Assembly symmetry: D5
Homo-oligomer: 89 residues x 10
């Protein structure tokens, strides 16, 4: 954390634990997908791709927790997720 | 900024990389601002930090929707868990 | 996140620190997004990256104004150079 | 120091990158010096640190003006908030 | 990679991809377990613990690949895994 | 070195942390040495690097066995996949 | 700092503050000088070059403070600064 | 991993670089393992950490001997100080 | 280790870069050693740390003299402030 | 800068940490300088870099001797391999 825990509210520190978890999951997805493209061993590629897609599940579960515990995550995710049409509108 | 040479990476893999790292940086900004909002002792600064914080969540949501539309398993797993009720680990 | 122990830092110094590091992070995001806007090969992603990029500039601007209002030398030097004509080094 | 290959970046984008990172480093120096000014217990050193600190703000202001002149959205947003009177938000 | 790809054999580079994956999985196991102890929200704690134990599975699968593709991983893992008695005397 | 305050971590969690970061450092050394073994143009150095490399694998295996004996889920997952035949993802 | 502040003398910590400041000035000098060579905008280049040279003044001022507050900085700086001929021979 | 482009470095410089960074990594492992031995509260883990630690010292010593044999000033300065008597500075 | 591509950097700029980063590394070593001299509880180690510390200052001074001889503004500003009397800001 | 809380580390472990990290920094300086010696195109600078380089080796040898005198396993393993003539991986 960037600020002393003494001044952070309990909810802020739990959301921090969730946010940094999603960040690490996102990094694993990207790392694994790049290694899937570059790997020259098909058995390794199958393991990497399997783990990659489970990191996406890990991230989705934690993002749902954030949505349920943060009004503005809920509002903004409701606005854009599972839509059609230009996203910037 | 990629882990493997760009010559061996598919074009779509690199575009998802650009989106993924963007979402990561937005999430980092949400966390950073929320912590600074708790710690700040200047009300005018707090209002700015909180304003920015919640717009970073919008940036993250937009980029995540692009990722969802361009990656089948992001779409599948987000569909399983987002906007649900009851235990998340049971959905 | 501070380089000196908080016990010896004035409250206002820590608040300006919170503002300065926020501007720094916004500036990094602007640069990161602008480079991805040039390199992106998906137009839908590019529009999102460009939208976010320009809102980071607004976040930086709001926090910069707070700094101007809370630091006399930020005020002096920003007054000298921002919104001028002619060579910048000669203002 | 760029995140994308120079081959795909427009020339103006790389110059704005040079300006942006310069402002970031100036901002970092302002923050570092101001903290050391508070903590220093030697008046002669403190005077030097404060002198350097305030010149870093001038370095940042000049480079920011270049950005304002070379990026329409920097100009737009800086004009909205800089040198204003009421609540910033 | 720490050396130019031009001087690395393909199998060395594939083992690198596997090794670094295991490293990242281990780091995730450690991070999640600490967050499980520290979390004060029961729903978050259940997610963190679920993710933690699946990272161990990711690591195990990747370790088996290393065992099958590296004679000294095979030898040393065979010597120590699933043993009884002092680990430093096997 | 811990991500959470030691005050809230169970002793076993901290000891597993010590073992896990040790295995990570062994793995990094294995990878670093193997690449330097491939790139080195001095056979006497190569022989030292290769010797050290294979001993790091032993240090990792010893520490993993400690993890296996002190963590039921390490024991379960390692039992499932190590020393198998056939597709690794299906075991 | 690398050691706990309770065991560090006051003068050591002030010298630390000056030393780290010189290091950051030197880094800015190097960064700006490389951007001056690479920049393709003359108006930007003039700003970068102006800032670059003032960093040198910030480092020089702080180094003088070190010289006045550290006997060995004073000795070694006097031996080599403003000399002629092979620097390693002084 | 080098600070200068490989095209301007002599072969002998890059091999010494490989050895030096190896020794640095071994030294770091000795230090980490030694601190963990002091802090560990599981005797079985402590025996493993202490075993690995002491083998890292052997890895460093082997690689350092290679440097001594491939660099005239390493040989000169190590001969001056290692295994001496009396104040180290005055030797 | 440069921030701009070497093809657009002049030879002299790169040589100045080599000198500047060397001075930076010397300064860091001076600081690191001086803190360890204060904190060490072993007198013979303290004597080695202090010996090394003072030679790093000599290394920095030599390299800084090279910079002075190869950069007009280093020569100007070091001339103005080094070996002066009175308020350092007033010189 | 320790990896474990100072409250649980023995005094001798902390002093060995101070020496170990010192050698690591000396080694890194040797490597950095040696690469700059090869890449430098200014003979006056190259002479300084080479002079400094070789003194860093002396700094490393002095601190390494302290380690030898204050750690039984460093002494044992250094004695086995330093100042030998036969193949290193054969004791
Ligand atoms: Ca492929
Ligand atoms: Ca295979
Ligand atoms: Ca004030
Ligand atoms: Ca004060
Ligand atoms: Ca001035
Ligand atoms: Ca010990
Ligand atoms: Ca000497
Ligand atoms: Ca002999
Ligand atoms: Fe995961
Ligand atoms: Fe944003
Ligand atoms: Fe922002
Ligand atoms: Fe500056
Ligand atoms: Fe995983
Ligand atoms: Fe090891
Ligand atoms: Fe400066
Ligand atoms: Fe080792
Ligand atoms: Fe030195
Ligand atoms: Fe040194």
């Amino acid at each position: 954390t960037h600020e002393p825990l003494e001044v952070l509210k309990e909810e802020t520190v739990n959301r921090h634990r969730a946010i940094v978890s999603v960040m690490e999951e996102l990094a694993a997805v990207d790392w694994y997908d790049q290694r899937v493209d570059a790997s020259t061993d098909p058995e390794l590629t199958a393991i990497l791709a399997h783990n990659r897609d489970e990191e996406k599940e890990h991230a989705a579960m934690t993002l749902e927790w954030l949505r349920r515990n943060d009004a503005k995550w809920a509002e903004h995710l409701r606005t854009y997720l599972f839509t059609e049409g230009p996203i910037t509108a």
